[PDB]
Design a protein around this motif. Sequence first.
Motif, short mmCIF file in Angstrom:
data_model
loop_
_atom_site.label_atom_id
_atom_site.label_comp_id
_atom_site.label_asym_id
_atom_site.label_seq_id
_atom_site.Cartn_x
_atom_site.Cartn_y
_atom_site.Cartn_z
N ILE A 78 27.26 -27.87 80.15
CA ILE A 78 25.99 -28.50 79.77
C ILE A 78 25.30 -29.24 80.93
CG2 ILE A 78 26.62 -28.57 77.32
CD1 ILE A 78 27.06 -31.70 77.92
N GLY A 79 25.85 -29.14 82.14
CA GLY A 79 25.26 -29.74 83.32
C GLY A 79 26.06 -29.43 84.57
N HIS A 80 25.42 -29.50 85.74
CA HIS A 80 26.10 -29.27 87.01
C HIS A 80 25.53 -30.16 88.08
CE1 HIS A 80 22.98 -26.02 87.14
NE2 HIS A 80 22.79 -26.50 88.37
N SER A 81 26.41 -30.72 88.89
CA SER A 81 26.05 -31.60 89.98
C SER A 81 27.07 -31.44 91.11
CB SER A 81 25.93 -33.05 89.50
OG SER A 81 27.16 -33.76 89.50
N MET A 82 26.75 -31.95 92.29
CA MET A 82 27.60 -31.80 93.44
C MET A 82 27.86 -33.15 94.09
SD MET A 82 26.88 -29.24 96.56
CE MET A 82 25.35 -30.03 97.08
N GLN A 83 29.12 -33.45 94.37
CA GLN A 83 29.48 -34.67 95.06
C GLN A 83 30.26 -34.25 96.26
OE1 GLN A 83 31.79 -37.67 93.04
NE2 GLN A 83 31.57 -39.08 94.78
N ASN A 84 29.62 -34.25 97.43
CA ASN A 84 30.21 -33.80 98.68
C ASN A 84 30.62 -32.31 98.52
OD1 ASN A 84 29.91 -36.48 100.12
ND2 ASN A 84 31.35 -37.12 98.54
N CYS A 85 31.87 -31.93 98.79
CA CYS A 85 32.30 -30.54 98.67
C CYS A 85 32.89 -30.19 97.31
CB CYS A 85 33.25 -30.17 99.79
SG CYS A 85 32.69 -30.67 101.43
N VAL A 86 32.74 -31.07 96.30
CA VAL A 86 33.21 -30.76 94.97
C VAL A 86 32.03 -30.59 94.03
CG1 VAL A 86 34.16 -32.23 93.04
CG2 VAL A 86 35.66 -31.28 94.86
N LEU A 87 32.16 -29.62 93.16
CA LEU A 87 31.21 -29.29 92.13
C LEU A 87 31.70 -29.94 90.84
CD1 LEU A 87 28.78 -27.22 91.39
CD2 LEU A 87 30.64 -25.80 90.55
N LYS A 88 30.79 -30.58 90.10
CA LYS A 88 31.10 -31.23 88.84
C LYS A 88 30.34 -30.50 87.74
CE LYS A 88 30.16 -35.70 89.80
NZ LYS A 88 30.24 -36.69 90.91
N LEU A 89 31.07 -29.94 86.80
CA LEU A 89 30.48 -29.20 85.70
C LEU A 89 30.67 -30.00 84.45
CD1 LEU A 89 31.85 -25.65 86.49
CD2 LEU A 89 29.61 -26.54 87.01
N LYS A 90 29.60 -30.56 83.92
CA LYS A 90 29.65 -31.31 82.68
C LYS A 90 29.86 -30.28 81.56
CE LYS A 90 28.18 -35.44 81.57
NZ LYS A 90 27.08 -35.33 80.57
N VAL A 91 30.80 -30.54 80.66
CA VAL A 91 31.09 -29.63 79.55
C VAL A 91 30.83 -30.33 78.21
CG1 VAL A 91 32.56 -27.96 80.76
CG2 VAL A 91 33.58 -30.04 79.82
N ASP A 92 30.67 -29.56 77.13
CA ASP A 92 30.39 -30.17 75.83
C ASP A 92 31.62 -30.78 75.14
OD1 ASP A 92 31.60 -27.72 75.12
OD2 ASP A 92 30.26 -27.43 73.38
N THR A 93 32.81 -30.52 75.66
CA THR A 93 34.04 -30.97 75.02
C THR A 93 34.86 -31.83 75.96
OG1 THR A 93 34.06 -28.93 73.75
CG2 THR A 93 36.15 -30.13 73.89
N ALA A 94 35.31 -33.01 75.51
CA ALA A 94 36.17 -33.83 76.34
C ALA A 94 37.59 -33.30 76.19
CB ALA A 94 36.12 -35.28 75.92
N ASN A 95 38.32 -33.17 77.30
CA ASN A 95 39.68 -32.67 77.32
C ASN A 95 40.57 -33.59 76.54
OD1 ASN A 95 42.11 -31.41 77.92
ND2 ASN A 95 42.05 -31.89 80.10
N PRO A 96 41.11 -33.13 75.40
CA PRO A 96 42.00 -33.99 74.62
C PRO A 96 43.30 -34.32 75.33
CG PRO A 96 41.99 -31.78 73.70
CD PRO A 96 40.93 -31.80 74.77
N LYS A 97 43.72 -33.48 76.29
CA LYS A 97 44.93 -33.74 77.04
C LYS A 97 44.67 -34.55 78.32
CE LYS A 97 46.89 -29.34 75.50
NZ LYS A 97 47.33 -28.02 76.02
N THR A 98 43.50 -35.20 78.45
CA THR A 98 43.20 -36.01 79.63
C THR A 98 44.19 -37.18 79.73
OG1 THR A 98 40.83 -35.49 79.39
CG2 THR A 98 41.38 -37.30 80.87
#
Lengths: 305, 300
Positions: A78-98
């Motif tokens: 549901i979104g994408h952004s970049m922080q230095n050399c890492v890509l951050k992909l916002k997803v619709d579901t939070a990882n329950p095993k976080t």
Amino acid sequence: SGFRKMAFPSGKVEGCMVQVTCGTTTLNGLWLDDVVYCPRHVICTSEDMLNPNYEDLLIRKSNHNFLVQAGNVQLRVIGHSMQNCVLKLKVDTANPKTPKYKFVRIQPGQTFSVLACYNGSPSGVYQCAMRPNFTIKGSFLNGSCGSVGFNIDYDCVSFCYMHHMELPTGVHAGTDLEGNFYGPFVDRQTAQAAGTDTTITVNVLAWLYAAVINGDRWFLNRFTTTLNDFNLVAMKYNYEPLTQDHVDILGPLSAQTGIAVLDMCASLKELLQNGMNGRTILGSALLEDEFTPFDVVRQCSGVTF
Amino acid sequence: SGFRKMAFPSGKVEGCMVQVTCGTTTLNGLWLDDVVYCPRHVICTSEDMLNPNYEDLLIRKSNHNFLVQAGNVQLRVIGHSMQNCVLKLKVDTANPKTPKYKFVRIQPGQTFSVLACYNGSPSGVYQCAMRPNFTIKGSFLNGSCGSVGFNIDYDCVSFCYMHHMELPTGVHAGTDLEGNFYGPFVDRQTAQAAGTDTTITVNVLAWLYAAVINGDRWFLNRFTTTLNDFNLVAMKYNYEPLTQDHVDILGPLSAQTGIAVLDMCASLKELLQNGMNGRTILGSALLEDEFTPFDVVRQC
Ligand SMILES: COCCO[C@@H](C(=O)Nc1cncc2ccccc12)c1ccc(Cl)c(Cl)c1
Ligand SMILES: COCCO[C@H](C(=O)Nc1cncc2ccccc12)c1ccc(Cl)c(Cl)c1
Ligand SMILES: [Cl-]
């Protein structure tokens, strides 16, 4: 008894590994809360890699271009952004095993466990050290990009590494979880070489203390040295300088074994100048530098996670 | 590229580790479905250790004597039975984190990952080989009993080891997950010593093939040898005999690198005679024997 190269239990990290596909490229992502972290080079093609403008490449991508897969379940980006050399992909579901986690940047000489993955699936775990030349001597095949390095502190996973690439000598380069590379490396297809490496002195001493705790004492001698004289000898053998901080950190091992740090330094000094003479220490004919003082204490005391 | 001693991811096994307490003794159990498996010596006292009669000691036990703890939740023991040197505690809850699993007894030279635990809590994971003398060179402190050895090939966990004890030389003895000890060991405090250990020849050759795949070739030579002449040389260096089965198993690595098994055997013969001469193979100054042919192919 026994001293092994031991990694942290990888369970808390396995629950975060996902597969990230962008076009022809498939690599691994770290799913934490509602964000998937992965190397930004996933958005590159064979031409792009040579001289890529990641801001321009990412602006052309849409959320549906990233196919994220957690097991046999496709996550919705549901979104994408970049922080230095890492890509951050916002997803619709939070990882329950976080798990409880932090992002930490480590220093040369520090150790961490690597959970090697291919297609978002963990295949193995091993313990490695961030070399003084900021590379890691990992074991990685094509597709392992996005595999992470971590430590566990109590019940908190500290993520310290994400694999980006392999250098021409077979050693590996990567970033912290904020996308900042360890070392003078870039995520671009160009001539890059690892610097001349050095041996992690404080870790060699910690491992000599581990050998003593295990009953290996042949290398011990009656001698001591000044910190300065030791550093002058060590520097001649491509060994990292030993600081007062390192001497202080080796304090508990010195107290347990009854061998002062400068006393063990005199044994290391003799080992460097004379060799092992057919003898081994902890089943090794070389001085091992990928066990930190904390690793030695943790393994010889049985700290659990 | 690179060659590391690599353990299997331990997550599927961590979800099975529980603490088993019987009187003063506390060790680890493996919780699979509604059964917790643990070393039967948990039922022993200090006086019933040299010559325990486990059948008699277990008949005096009741289910409420066994305190099983999975995290901060106490499991209720609803039955107890013994299969060789392993105690099976039937519980009133099936482990929801039970993976797809099998119990496999392994042979000398075979490798596996060990999840070292203390009080039912995983502290570390490492790679081991079952030595030809049926001991393992593990890293274990008091309270590590019940820690398990496993392989995780394709979604399924094969349990091959359960740690029972430490021998006087610091090496370790244990059983398969059916309670049968590997080696001539017993779960009694009687005088027991590990036999003279030997090098796992087939694993050393597999590791030399991994070194070639990684670009290390300094140790290769123009020679080949007969299997018998190699075995006569190898035996003089405390190396295990290399059988035709081992030569066959090394076939795929021989095909990939273009170096015949008997050809690599001549490289191993030369290394045994000469030593390394200041050089290393895969960052090691000794010949490594805890990587099987299957491990090398998998990792490369
Ligand atoms: C928690 O109960 C532990 C009981 O002690 C066992 C025991 O040696 N285990 C331990 C396991 N691993 C490493 C160790 C390193 C230091 C000390 C012990 C270690 C033991 C003692 C003798 C016999 Cl014959 C048997 Cl069956 C088992
Ligand atoms: C999924 O494709 C990822 C490709 O990553 C390349 C790459 O070397 N990575 C690989 C990672 N780890 C081990 C490898 C061992 C064999 C081969 C590749 C390996 C690579 C090459 C140059 C650059 Cl500048 C970058 Cl950013 C990345
Ligand atoms: Cl493996």
